[PDB]
Amino acid sequence: GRFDHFVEWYIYLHKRTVSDISSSIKELEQQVNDLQRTVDGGMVSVKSLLEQMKFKLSEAIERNDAAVSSRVLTESVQK
Amino acid sequence: GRFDHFVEWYIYLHKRTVSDISSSIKELEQQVNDLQRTVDGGMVSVKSLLEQMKFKLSEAIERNDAAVSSRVLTESVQK
Structure with a gap:
């Protein structure tokens, strides 16, 4: 079983409550x-x-919109 | 022959020159x-x-001092 995937998913549920x-x-x-x-003033340096x-910020503003829109069970009741 | 080391050293010499x-x-x-x-600017982060x-800066102090100092000759002359 993918227990490493489970513990990463469980960590994400804890840090998504x-x-x-x-x-x-x-x-x-x-x-x-x-x-x-x-x-x-500009200044590229x-x-x-x-x-x-x-x-x-754009990369993290993705991987969240699907998590809110395509959500049927809340992220704490799964935990 | 370590042509990898030579070409890395030569890009070093071009940038320094x-x-x-x-x-x-x-x-x-x-x-x-x-x-x-x-x-x-506020919070450091x-x-x-x-x-x-x-x-x-410490690298350029304790390594380039030999190459610019009297022990090792001028880098443009090396090039």
Whole structure:
């Protein structure tokens, strides 16, 4: 049996009983907004970090929309 | 013959010739100044690149001092 897949799934249920969308939304947006308010003059030499952060925020803003829209059982009752 | 080592060494020499020795050492201090720009932006959150560049300065101090000093001759002459 895929017990490693089970323990990763169980970890994701524990951190999806509020504390993963929190991570994907709040801290990623606040890092992105901090960089956006940092770079108001431009200057690619720290804008390099920002595009990586915004791409990571986009990558984590995927893998969540299907998890909310295609959800019949809530993520705690499965646990 | 370690042509891999030669071509890596020769890209090192090209970068150091066109940038590090034509108008002094610049590619490390520009990202040092990037860290001095981003060190007081609020929440720090940049510990991944806070220390991985700090020992690059130490690398350029304790390895290039032999190559620029009296023991090993001038790098443009090596090229």
